[PDB]
Design a protein around this ligand. Structure first.
Ligand code: AGS
Ligand code: SF4
Ligand code: SF4
Lengths: 306, 326, 282, 323
């Protein structure tokens, strides 16, 4: 109980602050107490505003963007977690090898990467010179789905369950470059943190006890070290998931992706403040719920808290 | 004549949360400690971890305010909210900490560390502060060339020497020493103890010597105060407490202390259990869970310090041994 | 002496010395751009429109890294861009470091209501991604190089506040801060003369990550049009609306991004050198 | 049982190594208690981690002989070392709080130790773990299987380490300062536990500690370490009534037990020699009150004396305390 209650007691003051600053933005930049109550009452009924170019409600624009951003963010974080964790463990276990110097070297290069430029380079190499993978969009303009079906709005699900033959490998081919491009800073940070964490843990007194019990080197690494070295990792993961939208504004623009970052930056370039004002509230909201989820996850894995 | 320092009924309770905001328990880290300290004498405070000896040290050097009781220096009160009392508090009572590695600022030179007290509290010029600091270094056994060096350039003994030298800069007459020789080697330990006895005999200092090592206390002390669960359980001169211990915890603590000479190895009495947590203190006498002499009143009441032949003990079994009608 | 001990350990990281050599070279190119750059960064050579680098068949030594889609020389634009990139990064890091250290000492030393007010404001302005909050402020206040730099200065304060406040709470519990309080030291002396010299090791490394982030985020703002304006030689601005050249003129897409990546990598290499030298790690 | 000969442990570059242990030799019989006494920088703990194979990548170990139970620990395989470590030789370490893995319960950590060597089903293993927690004196062994290490005291943490070390009934137990971190009563409890296990299971015990008085109560034989070298060996009563090395004599005169009420304690000048400071001849040359030009030229042998003791000195002391 008490750990959850202690963290909710910091989330609520933050959510009140986000709501007060969004009310200040909506009052000061047009497209006290009674007006604040009227504003948050409207937001709770879904009245986030009307988008100036389309005249569609901001929530009815948002839902497709959130799905198409979450699908991309999931794939990018799958790439980063799957590839990054094994490499950081091997780098710490093989300290000073050609593998360690290459893993540290490539991670430092990814952590310093201008995301928008590197996606232009992969369009130029993979899509223009080698011609392996499509340059633009979420699925090929060949692909269309009967709207009669209970389509989820996630293309990797929808084109598998209700798609024609050969449409699913199209929905995957369009996903590869956006997921690698968005996943690169997360991958670099997961390699860096997994390595430093593992070298910290491999130097602890309980690893000397694990060796002194006669345990195999693989069991000392996977059972004893990695369970402890994962706690820090969890944190960073949480951090990066919040930062993925930053990378998505840059990534979605070059790949012409339907998405929440492209919708926001087009609104900021238009001065379409109804989309910006509703959008920063929903984005803010998601971040603090994600943060809360992560910290509940950390307090479940961590016995010191549990 | 008033004693140099006098503590009457000192207390320190820290409020704590039982995993919930409402229940408001008190951690009775210290309650009912009282003593008189004379000029040129060592009072040793002895006990195991959790006994209140370090919070007593922090109260006496005024790092923390007490929850109750009185603290007098030469007959005037040190617990007042009064800017005139600062001139007693900072000059006359001083502290030497346990850890030589954490008690010196690692980004200051030794000259800076010793001159900071004089810069804050005194009117001395830059030349006069350096002359006084170099004289204190020479008194404490550091070299004139050490004045430019940072704490990480010194051994644990040389760091405890800088810490003693800093403590003496304002010309004190009470020094509180919180486990001052615990981390040090045998040789370095010896070195350090010889220095503290030389400084007492030269300058007239009185020590409040907080210690876990009874071997060192049998050497440096004049009076010994034995602590259990925030209360004093036995108090008396060194010869009384080491040659005639009357309280069961003092007998157990001396019987558990290892001794090199075979003839001085006392009868082994071995206690059960852990020292109890101060969040959930035992009812009546705090030692009744571990004691070999448990008796009718011990679970019902706290005992009080009484004079039994010139030493004070807080024990109902000693009261019945001296008063058979009890 | 501790500065020679720091330099001795910094020299042990060979990558960090390679980073420092590049930063000195780019700073020299940034200072002397007026004299080194072969042409003015806005001058148009319309007889040599979309001319390739000097090592390709349509090119000449007159334009080493080629020309853009209006005939401007790319080399000169890259080094006047190096000048803007370093001046913005320096202004962002210095202002965010000064204001963040003071608010973090004031939070970590005094505690109580001051720590709660400061840390709730910091947690509110971290409720958005750094770049999204900078974009919103520059879109409220209009896009310009100055506006972008002030937005980047503001959104960076949380990291310096949170790091300094975290370091100060690790020092304030120690016996040397307590011994200084028993000796009579006031709050100003405790913060700036005693605790701050011990917090400075974390901050010297964080300033290198700050330079890297200010360069990446200024280039991101410039790419998205919400930064330096189109005539200016800023590296992200040179990558705004260039993707149609990926087939016909690879040099326009390539070299501004290598200038960013190379510069950020040099500050990140140097930063892990500062980490190896200032921590008791080796 | 254990037979160490010419053992050396080095750190740093081979042109100028830090000789943390330097041509030491000692033997342990089954059922013997051996104390290893020394100050800071003596190499005492390092000599024991070199038996366990716990010296890591920047360090080196070499010996003329390093037999345990008839097997040469220099040339056995990695698998064969794991069949000794925990099963025939076991170790307990200096800090109770850091030495148990904080992510796993006490029962997982003991049942894992039993599994690695003895095997058996879950039930069997759990039974043997309850048996061990009862044997080391835990007040409720069934509930203490389910606690995490941060819920234990220092005393209970060290009892769990002893239960986990003795789980396979080893022939040798090494105790590297097992009680330095603990209160005096808890120290007395843990060392009377170790000596009860030692006598009941007919097990060899190596006590590594700086406390001379604690070893004088516990040990049969004492080995005195200085600057990475053994300087004296002998029976625990004889060694401190009549010391045969000037170092041991100095060491005793520095104890506050060894003096009248408030007379000054003796102490040697100087500091223990590190990598750069190391003297020629005898390593006590800068400090020894009896130093002579022979001592400055020759490294002294570990001289075998008439009563069966050894001291690493050119002039082994008489019973009055003179060369
Ligand atoms: N801030 C605090 N809040 C609550 N309890 C405290 C606090 N500070 C100390 N205590 C308790 O005070 C009790 C009495 O002993 P202490 O004053 O801490 O000294 P001590 O433990 O005997 O000596 P130590 O171990 O060498 S610091 C301990 O059991 C602590 O848990
Ligand atoms: S009062 Fe009772 S419990 Fe306390 S020491 Fe005396 S006999 Fe033991
Ligand atoms: S050999 Fe010489 S210097 Fe060494 S301990 Fe003996 S008398 Fe002293």
């Amino acid at each position: 109980l008490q750990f959850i209650l202690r963290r909710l007691g910091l989330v609520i003051p933050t959510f009140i602050g986000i709501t007060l600053l969004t009310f200040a933005f909506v009052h000061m930049i047009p497209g006290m107490w009674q007006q604040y109550l009227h504003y948050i009452w409207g937001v709770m009924h879904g009245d986030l505003g009307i988008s100036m170019k389309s005249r569609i409600p901001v929530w009815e624009e948002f839902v497709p963007r959130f799905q198409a951003t979450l699908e991309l963010g999931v794939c990018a974080m799958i790439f980063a977690t799957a590839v990054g964790i094994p490499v950081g463990v091997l780098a710490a276990v093989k300290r000073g090898s050609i593998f360690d110097h290459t893993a540290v070297g490539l991670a430092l290069t990814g952590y310093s990467m201008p995301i928008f430029w590197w996606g232009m380079m992969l369009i130029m190499l993979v899509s223009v010179h080698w011609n392996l993978t499509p340059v633009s969009g979420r699925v090929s303009d060949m692909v269309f789905l009967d709207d009669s079906n209970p389509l989820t709005g996630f293309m990797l699900i929808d084109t598998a369950i209700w798609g024609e033959d050969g449409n699913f490998i199209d929905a995957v081919a369009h996903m590869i470059l956006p997921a690698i491009v968005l996943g690169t800073i997360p991958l670099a940070v997961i390699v860096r943190m997994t390595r430093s964490s593992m070298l910290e843990v491999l130097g602890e007194d309980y690893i000397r006890t694990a060796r002194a019990k006669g345990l195999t080197r693989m069991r000392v690494i996977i059972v004893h070290a990695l369970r402890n070295a994962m706690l820090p990792v969890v944190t960073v993961i949480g951090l990066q998931v919040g930062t993925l939208l930053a990378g998505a504004i840059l990534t979605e623009t070059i790949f012409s992706w339907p998405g929440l970052g492209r919708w926001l930056i087009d609104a900021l370039q238009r001065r379409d403040y109804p989309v910006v004002q509703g959008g920063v509230l929903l984005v803010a909201t998601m971040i603090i719920l994600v943060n809360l989820l992560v910290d509940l996850l950390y307090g479940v894995v961590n016995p010191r808290i549990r | 004549q008033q004693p140099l320092l006098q503590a009457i009924d000192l207390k320190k309770h820290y409020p704590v949360k039982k995993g919930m905001f409402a229940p408001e328990r008190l951690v009775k880290a210290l309650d009912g400690v009282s003593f008189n300290l004379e000029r040129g004498k060592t009072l040793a405070v002895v006990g195991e971890s959790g006994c209140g000896k370090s919070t007593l040290g922090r109260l006496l050097t005024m790092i923390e305010m007490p929850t109750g009781g009185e603290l007098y220096y030469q007959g005037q009160d040190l617990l007042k909210h009064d800017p005139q009392a600062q001139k007693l508090r900072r000059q006359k009572i001083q502290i030497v900490f346990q850890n030589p590695y954490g008690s010196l600022n690692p980004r200051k030179k030794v000259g800076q560390i010793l001159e900071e007290p004089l810069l804050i509290n005194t009117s001395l010029s830059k030349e006069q502060r350096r002359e006084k600091a170099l004289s204190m270094m020479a008194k404490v056994g550091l070299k004139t060339e050490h004045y430019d060096r940072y704490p990480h350039m010194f051994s644990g003994g040389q760091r405890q020497r800088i810490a003693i030298a800093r403590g003496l800069m304002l010309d004190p007459d009470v020094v509180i020493a919180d486990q001052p020789v615990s981390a040090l080697d045998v040789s370095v330990r010896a070195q350090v103890l010889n220095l503290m006895m030389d400084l007492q005999q030269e300058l007239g200092l009185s020590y409040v010597f907080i210690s876990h090592d009874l071997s060192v206390v049998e050497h440096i002390a004049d009076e010994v105060m034995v602590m259990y669960l925030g209360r004093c359980v036995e108090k008396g001169t060194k010869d009384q407490i080491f040659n005639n211990p009357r309280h069961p915890y003092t007998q157990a603590l001396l019987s558990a202390t290892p001794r090199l000479n075979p003839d001085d190895r006392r009868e082994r009495i071995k206690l059960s259990g852990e020292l109890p947590s101060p969040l959930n203190p035992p009812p009546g006498c705090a030692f009744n869970a571990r004691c070999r002499r448990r008796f009718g009143p011990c679970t019902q009441l706290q005992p009080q310090l009484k004079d039994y032949g010139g030493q004070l003990v807080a024990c109902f079994a000693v009261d019945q041994d001296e008063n058979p009608q009890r | 002496t501790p500065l020679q001990e720091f330099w001795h350990y910094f020299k042990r990281n060979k990558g960090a010395v390679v980073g420092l050599v590049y930063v000195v070279i780019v700073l020299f190119i940034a200072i002397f751009a007026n004299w080194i750059a072969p042409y003015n960064p806005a001058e148009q050579f319309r007889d040599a429109l979309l001319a390739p680098p000097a090592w390709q068949e349509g090119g000449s030594m007159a334009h080493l890294l080629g020309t853009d889609d209006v005939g401007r020389d790319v080399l000169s634009r890259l080094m006047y861009g190096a000048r803007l990139s370093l001046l913005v990064g320096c202004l962002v890091v210095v202002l965010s470091l000064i204001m963040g250290v003071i608010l973090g000492l004031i939070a970590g030393y005094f505690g109580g209501l001051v720590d709660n007010i400061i840390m709730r404001v910091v947690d509110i302005m971290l409720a958005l991604p750094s770049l999204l909050l900078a974009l919103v402020l520059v879109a409220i206040f209009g896009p310009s190089i100055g506006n972008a730099a002030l937005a980047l200065t503001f959104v960076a304060l949380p990291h310096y506040v949170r790091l300094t406040r975290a370091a100060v709470l690790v020092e304030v519990n120690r016996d040397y801060v307590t011994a200084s309080r028993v000796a009579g030291a006031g709050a100003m002396r405790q913060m700036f003369i005693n605790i701050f010299p011990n917090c400075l090791a974390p901050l010297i490394v964080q300033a290198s990550l700050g330079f890297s982030n200010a360069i990446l985020d200024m280039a991101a703002l410039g790419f998205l049009g919400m930064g330096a304006q189109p005539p200016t030689p800023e590296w992200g601005t040179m990558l705004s609306d260039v993707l149609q050249f990926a087939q016909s003129a690879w040099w326009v897409v390539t070299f501004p991004g290598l200038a960013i990546l190379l510069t950020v990598l040099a500050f990140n290499l140097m930063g892990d050198g500062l980490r190896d030298a200032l921590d008791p790690k080796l | 049982l254990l037979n160490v000969d010419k053992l050396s442990v080095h750190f740093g570059d081979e042109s100028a190594p830090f000789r943390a242990v330097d041509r030491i030799s000692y033997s342990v019989k089954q059922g013997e208690v051996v104390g290893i006494v020394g100050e800071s920088g003596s190499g005492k703990s390092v000599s024991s981690l070199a038996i366990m194979g716990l010296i890591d990548y920047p360090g080196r170990v070499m010996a003329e002989k390093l037999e345990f139970n008839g097997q040469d620990l220099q040339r056995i395989s990695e698998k064969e070392r794991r069949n000794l470590v925990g099963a025939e030789v076991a170790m307990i370490f200096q800090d109770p709080m850091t030495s148990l893995n904080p992510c796993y319960t006490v029962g997982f950590q003991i049942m894992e130790a039993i599994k690695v060597h003895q095997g058996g089903n879950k039930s069997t293993r759990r039974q043997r773990a309850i048996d061990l927690l009862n044997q080391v004196g835990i007040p409720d062994p069934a509930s203490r299987l389910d606690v995490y290490p941060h819920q234990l005291s220092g005393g209970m943490s060290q009892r769990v380490m002893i239960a986990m070390a003795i789980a396979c009934r080893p022939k040798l137990l090494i105790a590297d300062q097992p009680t330095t971190a603990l209160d005096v009563t808890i120290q007395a409890q843990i060392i009377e536990l170790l000596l009860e296990l030692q006598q009941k299971e007919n097990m060899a015990l190596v006590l590594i500690t700086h406390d001379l008085a604690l070893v004088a109560e516990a040990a049969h034989k004492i080995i005195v370490m200085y600057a990475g070298q053994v300087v004296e060996t002998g029976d625990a009563h004889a060694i401190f009534h009549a010391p045969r090395h000037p170092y041991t004599q100095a060491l005793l005169r520095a104890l506050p037990e060894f003096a009248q009420d408030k007379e000054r304690l003796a102490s040697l000048p100087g500091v223990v020699p590190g990598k750069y400071d190391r003297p020629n001849g005898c390593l006590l040359n800068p400090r020894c009150p009896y130093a002579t030009d022979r001592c400055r030229a020759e490294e002294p042998a570990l001289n075998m004396l008439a009563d069966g003791r050894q001291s690493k000195c050119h002039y082994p002391l008489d019973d009055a305390g003179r060369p």
